[PDB]
Amino acid sequence: PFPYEFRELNPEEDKLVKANLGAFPTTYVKLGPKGYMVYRPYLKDAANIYNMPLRPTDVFVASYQRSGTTMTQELVWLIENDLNFEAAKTYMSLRYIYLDGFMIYDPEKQEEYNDILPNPENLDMERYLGLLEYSSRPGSSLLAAVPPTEKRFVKTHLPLSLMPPNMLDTVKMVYLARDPRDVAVSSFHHARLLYLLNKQSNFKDFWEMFHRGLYTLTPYFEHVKEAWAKRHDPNMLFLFYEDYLKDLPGSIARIADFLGKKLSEEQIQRLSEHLNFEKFKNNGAVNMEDYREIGILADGEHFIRKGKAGCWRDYFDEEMTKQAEKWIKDNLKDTDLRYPNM
Amino acid sequence: PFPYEFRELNPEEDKLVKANLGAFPTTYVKLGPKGYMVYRPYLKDAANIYNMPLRPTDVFVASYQRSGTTMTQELVWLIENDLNFEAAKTYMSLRYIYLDGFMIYDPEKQEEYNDILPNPENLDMERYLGLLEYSSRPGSSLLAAVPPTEKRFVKTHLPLSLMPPNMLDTVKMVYLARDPRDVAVSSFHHARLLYLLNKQSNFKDFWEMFHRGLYTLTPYFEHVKEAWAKRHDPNMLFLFYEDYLKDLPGSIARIADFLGKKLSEEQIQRLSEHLNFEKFKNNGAVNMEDYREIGILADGEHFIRKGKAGCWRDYFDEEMTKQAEKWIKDNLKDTDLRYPNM
Ligand SMILES: Nc1ncnc2c1ncn2[C@@H]1O[C@H](COP(=O)(O)O)[C@@H](OP(=O)(O)O)[C@H]1O
Ligand SMILES: Nc1ncnc2c1ncn2[C@@H]1O[C@H](COP(=O)(O)O)[C@@H](OP(=O)(O)O)[C@H]1O
Ligand SMILES: CC1=C(/C=C/C(C)=C/C=C/C(C)=C/CO)C(C)(C)CCC1=O
Ligand SMILES: CC1=C(/C=C/C(C)=C/C=C/C(C)=C/CO)C(C)(C)CCC1=O
Ligand SMILES: [Ca+2]
Ligand SMILES: [Ca+2]
Ligand SMILES: [Hg+2]
Ligand SMILES: [Hg+2]
């Protein structure tokens, strides 16, 4: 009973997209009345995700990407698992199901994906083919494969409107937002990390695409505003990335309270030390460096990258800065939505 | 020591021009005893252009407009640059100096030019002002600014009589001629393209003006006859547009030999494929679509349009057709100038 249509990109939209992602085989469509950008393969599973059976022990960590998902995942996993740090040494990608991870790969275009790499011959092919096959599996079927006697930890960048309405009746969700200018920067570098972008494009080209609602799972503010509207719900915790930076212990204590777990001061500090940036970036369980072994990550880029707020000012000229200002102001008019650092 | 005088259009001439181009702020004068139609700002540089210092490595591509100039510029530039296709990816407007480009713009009438656009609010104003400023720079001074250690590639629609006499003692020139009926049609669509025409004017009105010597840089036949009289000079290569369509490889071979290169069959075929109409129309380095981004090109027109010979028959009624026959006949009488397809 899926209520949304999709439409093709128009010429002006295709041109902005091509200038950033013209080589990349997976194309986009706009989904529903907000025109959320999904990679085409998402459509085959869209109705299944909209009707996915949920369970009372499910926990979700949701965000527009590059907004503090990985940090939160670790925190929530450890807190739910009685601070069992040993058990958390397993890869994050085996500990959470990535609901919408599949959509980026179209199995119909298998050949085209490794033309994107500068050194295809140096791939560990067994792990690469293993990765392609895993990514062929729709997220809904991944979710459903977990036995009911195992707590399901779910990661998604999908907006609330593409999942079951009233899912929060059943499941708990922690949602992260972050200043979109820093989101834009981090998303630029993350696209470079996975070879999504043309080498000839620059960050301003990325910005143009991002703030106009033409990158993956934007419009950005619509995505945030959907969660913001449900923040009052006892089963939603809306956090800001920037509060992790200002007050990590305070943020952890909020998450623990939200999830029903009492923690001592000593346990919060240990959790906080564990999320120290330099330590976490060196953590093979969460830093995605296992994928570099496979040969699909680009030189220079890292999945855990800098860990700062406000460094967008390094990338924005005076023109882009005024474009960001106008865009943010228009989108915060007639709402109580405010960002902590802004 | 400029030997020519100019006159204003008489009332009868003025009525006809004003009927087609009156909205356009830049007006015409007739220059010299043949009465070449020049936009008025030409006069401030006419003497400098008549006396421009020339250099033995200069190459000129000259024509009455819409006669195969752009294709020729590309072939000439690649042959001289050892078929370095990569370096040819820069805009043609940065690789050639347009000698007479400036004359279309009168800096005194700055304010009046954007008023001709249906949507002046959507100009990229930085790029639009940069274009105005560059067009204020007289052609001669642009040529003189190129250092002597860089080869000067020059594009012009000027007749030989307006440039230094005996220029062919020093420089090489490729001149293109084309069936004037097709030149007319192309010229009408190009006028539309840059918003030169009154939208209430039709092609017949354009033809009236064109074949009577009252459009830009006509009289048509006088222009062509000047170049044709020089076609046995070792530094003039006179080509017909129609020969590009019939035998593109043969034309390329004539150009390469003229420029002092001995190309192989394989190289000529590569240049030929590069000049395939559809590829070339979609070649952003030469199709002028960069100006559409500025906001100064009319919807439904393109600088690279159809690329056919003989399609003037779709624009000419039976009377215009005989008027064209009489005009060509009168002008080809007592000369050996003949066109391939005629
Ligand atoms: N422990 C930590 N402390 C601070 N920032 C962290 C972190 N772990 C990851 N990050 C950051 O969070 C951003 C990615 O979030 P997500 O997990 O949703 O993809 C990246 O931001 P930057 O690119 O600005 O460095 C990254 O460096
Ligand atoms: N590669 C190509 N092959 C054939 N015609 C071309 C071409 N590139 C440009 N043209 C054409 O040459 C004409 C313009 O010449 P110029 O470069 O001197 O302005 C236009 O003619 P049409 O309007 O009949 O299509 C255009 O379509
Ligand atoms: C980029 C890329 C691939 C995979 C990309 C993946 C798994 C990206 C995951 C990104 C994440 C987890 C971002 C943070 O949420 C394939 C392995 C599917 C194949 C080819 C490719 O280019
Ligand atoms: C038409 C026009 C302008 C410019 C026109 C140009 C650069 C035209 C070039 C035409 C060519 C290359 C014709 C064939 O060689 C300005 C940008 C100078 C300003 C106003 C205007 O109407
Ligand atoms: Ca391949
Ligand atoms: Ca004006
Ligand atoms: Hg900073
Ligand atoms: Hg034709």
JSON list of C-alpha atoms in Angstrom, two decimals, chain B residues 21-144:
[
{"chain": "B", "resi": 21, "resn": "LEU", "atom": "CA", "xyz": [17.00, 45.08, -36.31]},
{"chain": "B", "resi": 22, "resn": "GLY", "atom": "CA", "xyz": [15.62, 48.37, -34.99]},
{"chain": "B", "resi": 23, "resn": "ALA", "atom": "CA", "xyz": [15.15, 47.20, -31.41]},
{"chain": "B", "resi": 24, "resn": "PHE", "atom": "CA", "xyz": [18.85, 46.38, -31.32]},
{"chain": "B", "resi": 25, "resn": "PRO", "atom": "CA", "xyz": [20.79, 49.34, -29.88]},
{"chain": "B", "resi": 26, "resn": "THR", "atom": "CA", "xyz": [23.93, 49.01, -32.04]},
{"chain": "B", "resi": 27, "resn": "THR", "atom": "CA", "xyz": [23.34, 50.70, -35.41]},
{"chain": "B", "resi": 28, "resn": "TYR", "atom": "CA", "xyz": [25.11, 50.34, -38.78]},
{"chain": "B", "resi": 29, "resn": "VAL", "atom": "CA", "xyz": [27.09, 52.50, -41.16]},
{"chain": "B", "resi": 30, "resn": "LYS", "atom": "CA", "xyz": [28.36, 51.59, -44.68]},
{"chain": "B", "resi": 31, "resn": "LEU", "atom": "CA", "xyz": [32.13, 51.62, -44.96]},
{"chain": "B", "resi": 32, "resn": "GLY", "atom": "CA", "xyz": [34.06, 52.26, -48.13]},
{"chain": "B", "resi": 33, "resn": "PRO", "atom": "CA", "xyz": [33.20, 52.21, -51.82]},
{"chain": "B", "resi": 34, "resn": "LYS", "atom": "CA", "xyz": [31.60, 48.70, -51.64]},
{"chain": "B", "resi": 35, "resn": "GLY", "atom": "CA", "xyz": [29.47, 49.86, -48.65]},
{"chain": "B", "resi": 36, "resn": "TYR", "atom": "CA", "xyz": [30.28, 47.00, -46.25]},
{"chain": "B", "resi": 37, "resn": "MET", "atom": "CA", "xyz": [27.77, 47.05, -43.39]},
{"chain": "B", "resi": 38, "resn": "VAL", "atom": "CA", "xyz": [29.61, 47.57, -40.13]},
{"chain": "B", "resi": 39, "resn": "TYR", "atom": "CA", "xyz": [28.21, 48.16, -36.71]},
{"chain": "B", "resi": 40, "resn": "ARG", "atom": "CA", "xyz": [29.13, 51.74, -35.77]},
{"chain": "B", "resi": 41, "resn": "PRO", "atom": "CA", "xyz": [31.67, 50.91, -33.02]},
{"chain": "B", "resi": 42, "resn": "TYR", "atom": "CA", "xyz": [33.87, 49.30, -35.73]},
{"chain": "B", "resi": 43, "resn": "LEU", "atom": "CA", "xyz": [35.00, 52.79, -36.84]},
{"chain": "B", "resi": 44, "resn": "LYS", "atom": "CA", "xyz": [37.04, 53.46, -33.67]},
{"chain": "B", "resi": 45, "resn": "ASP", "atom": "CA", "xyz": [39.35, 50.48, -34.55]},
{"chain": "B", "resi": 46, "resn": "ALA", "atom": "CA", "xyz": [39.08, 50.45, -38.36]},
{"chain": "B", "resi": 47, "resn": "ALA", "atom": "CA", "xyz": [42.38, 52.26, -38.95]},
{"chain": "B", "resi": 48, "resn": "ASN", "atom": "CA", "xyz": [44.20, 50.18, -36.32]},
{"chain": "B", "resi": 49, "resn": "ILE", "atom": "CA", "xyz": [42.90, 46.95, -37.98]},
{"chain": "B", "resi": 50, "resn": "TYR", "atom": "CA", "xyz": [43.91, 48.22, -41.44]},
{"chain": "B", "resi": 51, "resn": "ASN", "atom": "CA", "xyz": [47.46, 48.73, -40.06]},
{"chain": "B", "resi": 52, "resn": "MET", "atom": "CA", "xyz": [47.66, 45.87, -37.51]},
{"chain": "B", "resi": 53, "resn": "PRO", "atom": "CA", "xyz": [51.20, 44.49, -37.19]},
{"chain": "B", "resi": 54, "resn": "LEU", "atom": "CA", "xyz": [51.23, 40.90, -38.44]},
{"chain": "B", "resi": 55, "resn": "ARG", "atom": "CA", "xyz": [53.59, 37.98, -37.75]},
{"chain": "B", "resi": 56, "resn": "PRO", "atom": "CA", "xyz": [54.76, 35.08, -39.95]},
{"chain": "B", "resi": 57, "resn": "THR", "atom": "CA", "xyz": [53.18, 32.44, -37.64]},
{"chain": "B", "resi": 58, "resn": "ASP", "atom": "CA", "xyz": [49.68, 34.01, -37.62]},
{"chain": "B", "resi": 59, "resn": "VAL", "atom": "CA", "xyz": [46.84, 31.93, -39.00]},
{"chain": "B", "resi": 60, "resn": "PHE", "atom": "CA", "xyz": [43.47, 33.54, -39.92]},
{"chain": "B", "resi": 61, "resn": "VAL", "atom": "CA", "xyz": [40.16, 31.75, -40.40]},
{"chain": "B", "resi": 62, "resn": "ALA", "atom": "CA", "xyz": [37.95, 34.11, -42.34]},
{"chain": "B", "resi": 63, "resn": "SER", "atom": "CA", "xyz": [34.45, 34.00, -43.84]},
{"chain": "B", "resi": 64, "resn": "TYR", "atom": "CA", "xyz": [31.14, 35.68, -44.35]},
{"chain": "B", "resi": 65, "resn": "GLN", "atom": "CA", "xyz": [29.50, 34.43, -41.19]},
{"chain": "B", "resi": 66, "resn": "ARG", "atom": "CA", "xyz": [27.69, 31.08, -40.91]},
{"chain": "B", "resi": 67, "resn": "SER", "atom": "CA", "xyz": [29.81, 29.51, -43.68]},
{"chain": "B", "resi": 68, "resn": "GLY", "atom": "CA", "xyz": [31.82, 26.85, -41.75]},
{"chain": "B", "resi": 69, "resn": "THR", "atom": "CA", "xyz": [34.07, 29.08, -39.59]},
{"chain": "B", "resi": 70, "resn": "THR", "atom": "CA", "xyz": [33.79, 27.08, -36.33]},
{"chain": "B", "resi": 71, "resn": "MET", "atom": "CA", "xyz": [34.51, 23.69, -37.93]},
{"chain": "B", "resi": 72, "resn": "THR", "atom": "CA", "xyz": [37.47, 25.26, -39.70]},
{"chain": "B", "resi": 73, "resn": "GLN", "atom": "CA", "xyz": [38.84, 26.82, -36.49]},
{"chain": "B", "resi": 74, "resn": "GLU", "atom": "CA", "xyz": [38.81, 23.42, -34.84]},
{"chain": "B", "resi": 75, "resn": "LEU", "atom": "CA", "xyz": [40.58, 21.62, -37.71]},
{"chain": "B", "resi": 76, "resn": "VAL", "atom": "CA", "xyz": [43.18, 24.37, -38.12]},
{"chain": "B", "resi": 77, "resn": "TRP", "atom": "CA", "xyz": [43.88, 24.48, -34.35]},
{"chain": "B", "resi": 78, "resn": "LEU", "atom": "CA", "xyz": [44.28, 20.69, -33.96]},
{"chain": "B", "resi": 79, "resn": "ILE", "atom": "CA", "xyz": [46.52, 20.28, -37.04]},
{"chain": "B", "resi": 80, "resn": "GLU", "atom": "CA", "xyz": [48.82, 23.09, -35.81]},
{"chain": "B", "resi": 81, "resn": "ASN", "atom": "CA", "xyz": [48.79, 21.59, -32.33]},
{"chain": "B", "resi": 82, "resn": "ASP", "atom": "CA", "xyz": [49.82, 18.07, -33.44]},
{"chain": "B", "resi": 83, "resn": "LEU", "atom": "CA", "xyz": [46.32, 16.63, -32.92]},
{"chain": "B", "resi": 84, "resn": "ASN", "atom": "CA", "xyz": [46.50, 17.25, -29.16]},
{"chain": "B", "resi": 85, "resn": "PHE", "atom": "CA", "xyz": [42.81, 16.55, -28.60]},
{"chain": "B", "resi": 86, "resn": "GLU", "atom": "CA", "xyz": [43.15, 17.08, -24.85]},
{"chain": "B", "resi": 87, "resn": "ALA", "atom": "CA", "xyz": [44.35, 20.68, -25.19]},
{"chain": "B", "resi": 88, "resn": "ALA", "atom": "CA", "xyz": [41.52, 21.42, -27.70]},
{"chain": "B", "resi": 89, "resn": "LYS", "atom": "CA", "xyz": [39.03, 20.85, -24.82]},
{"chain": "B", "resi": 90, "resn": "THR", "atom": "CA", "xyz": [39.41, 24.58, -23.88]},
{"chain": "B", "resi": 91, "resn": "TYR", "atom": "CA", "xyz": [36.77, 26.99, -25.20]},
{"chain": "B", "resi": 92, "resn": "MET", "atom": "CA", "xyz": [37.27, 28.05, -28.84]},
{"chain": "B", "resi": 93, "resn": "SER", "atom": "CA", "xyz": [36.82, 31.66, -27.64]},
{"chain": "B", "resi": 94, "resn": "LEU", "atom": "CA", "xyz": [40.06, 31.31, -25.59]},
{"chain": "B", "resi": 95, "resn": "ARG", "atom": "CA", "xyz": [41.99, 29.68, -28.43]},
{"chain": "B", "resi": 96, "resn": "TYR", "atom": "CA", "xyz": [41.09, 32.19, -31.17]},
{"chain": "B", "resi": 97, "resn": "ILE", "atom": "CA", "xyz": [40.89, 35.94, -31.13]},
{"chain": "B", "resi": 98, "resn": "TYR", "atom": "CA", "xyz": [37.75, 37.21, -32.79]},
{"chain": "B", "resi": 99, "resn": "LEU", "atom": "CA", "xyz": [39.12, 40.26, -34.61]},
{"chain": "B", "resi": 100, "resn": "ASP", "atom": "CA", "xyz": [35.78, 41.98, -35.34]},
{"chain": "B", "resi": 101, "resn": "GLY", "atom": "CA", "xyz": [33.83, 40.56, -32.34]},
{"chain": "B", "resi": 102, "resn": "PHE", "atom": "CA", "xyz": [33.91, 43.87, -30.52]},
{"chain": "B", "resi": 103, "resn": "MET", "atom": "CA", "xyz": [31.92, 45.89, -33.00]},
{"chain": "B", "resi": 104, "resn": "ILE", "atom": "CA", "xyz": [28.51, 44.53, -31.98]},
{"chain": "B", "resi": 105, "resn": "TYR", "atom": "CA", "xyz": [28.82, 46.34, -28.64]},
{"chain": "B", "resi": 106, "resn": "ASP", "atom": "CA", "xyz": [28.59, 50.07, -27.95]},
{"chain": "B", "resi": 107, "resn": "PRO", "atom": "CA", "xyz": [29.75, 50.83, -24.34]},
{"chain": "B", "resi": 108, "resn": "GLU", "atom": "CA", "xyz": [27.81, 54.11, -24.57]},
{"chain": "B", "resi": 109, "resn": "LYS", "atom": "CA", "xyz": [24.61, 52.06, -24.76]},
{"chain": "B", "resi": 110, "resn": "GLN", "atom": "CA", "xyz": [25.41, 49.58, -21.88]},
{"chain": "B", "resi": 111, "resn": "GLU", "atom": "CA", "xyz": [22.01, 50.01, -20.21]},
{"chain": "B", "resi": 112, "resn": "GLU", "atom": "CA", "xyz": [20.01, 49.26, -23.37]},
{"chain": "B", "resi": 113, "resn": "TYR", "atom": "CA", "xyz": [21.40, 45.73, -24.10]},
{"chain": "B", "resi": 114, "resn": "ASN", "atom": "CA", "xyz": [19.88, 43.67, -21.28]},
{"chain": "B", "resi": 115, "resn": "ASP", "atom": "CA", "xyz": [16.46, 45.27, -22.02]},
{"chain": "B", "resi": 116, "resn": "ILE", "atom": "CA", "xyz": [16.34, 43.05, -25.14]},
{"chain": "B", "resi": 117, "resn": "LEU", "atom": "CA", "xyz": [16.20, 39.85, -23.04]},
{"chain": "B", "resi": 118, "resn": "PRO", "atom": "CA", "xyz": [12.86, 38.40, -21.93]},
{"chain": "B", "resi": 119, "resn": "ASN", "atom": "CA", "xyz": [14.33, 37.73, -18.46]},
{"chain": "B", "resi": 120, "resn": "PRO", "atom": "CA", "xyz": [17.15, 40.23, -17.58]},
{"chain": "B", "resi": 121, "resn": "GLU", "atom": "CA", "xyz": [16.79, 39.35, -13.85]},
{"chain": "B", "resi": 122, "resn": "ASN", "atom": "CA", "xyz": [18.28, 35.84, -14.55]},
{"chain": "B", "resi": 123, "resn": "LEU", "atom": "CA", "xyz": [21.60, 37.02, -15.91]},
{"chain": "B", "resi": 124, "resn": "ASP", "atom": "CA", "xyz": [24.69, 35.81, -14.15]},
{"chain": "B", "resi": 125, "resn": "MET", "atom": "CA", "xyz": [25.71, 39.48, -13.80]},
{"chain": "B", "resi": 126, "resn": "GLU", "atom": "CA", "xyz": [29.43, 38.85, -13.01]},
{"chain": "B", "resi": 127, "resn": "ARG", "atom": "CA", "xyz": [29.77, 36.81, -16.19]},
{"chain": "B", "resi": 128, "resn": "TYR", "atom": "CA", "xyz": [27.58, 39.18, -18.19]},
{"chain": "B", "resi": 129, "resn": "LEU", "atom": "CA", "xyz": [29.63, 42.25, -17.15]},
{"chain": "B", "resi": 130, "resn": "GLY", "atom": "CA", "xyz": [32.84, 40.33, -17.92]},
{"chain": "B", "resi": 131, "resn": "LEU", "atom": "CA", "xyz": [31.52, 39.72, -21.43]},
{"chain": "B", "resi": 132, "resn": "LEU", "atom": "CA", "xyz": [30.60, 43.40, -21.90]},
{"chain": "B", "resi": 133, "resn": "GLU", "atom": "CA", "xyz": [34.07, 44.44, -20.69]},
{"chain": "B", "resi": 134, "resn": "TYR", "atom": "CA", "xyz": [35.88, 41.97, -22.95]},
{"chain": "B", "resi": 135, "resn": "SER", "atom": "CA", "xyz": [33.70, 43.16, -25.93]},
{"chain": "B", "resi": 136, "resn": "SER", "atom": "CA", "xyz": [34.69, 46.78, -25.22]},
{"chain": "B", "resi": 137, "resn": "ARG", "atom": "CA", "xyz": [38.33, 45.83, -25.99]},
{"chain": "B", "resi": 138, "resn": "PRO", "atom": "CA", "xyz": [39.08, 46.63, -29.64]},
{"chain": "B", "resi": 139, "resn": "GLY", "atom": "CA", "xyz": [40.15, 43.59, -31.72]},
{"chain": "B", "resi": 140, "resn": "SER", "atom": "CA", "xyz": [43.51, 45.03, -32.74]},
{"chain": "B", "resi": 141, "resn": "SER", "atom": "CA", "xyz": [44.60, 45.47, -29.15]},
{"chain": "B", "resi": 142, "resn": "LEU", "atom": "CA", "xyz": [43.62, 41.86, -28.32]},
{"chain": "B", "resi": 143, "resn": "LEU", "atom": "CA", "xyz": [45.87, 40.60, -31.14]},
{"chain": "B", "resi": 144, "resn": "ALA", "atom": "CA", "xyz": [48.75, 42.85, -30.07]}
]
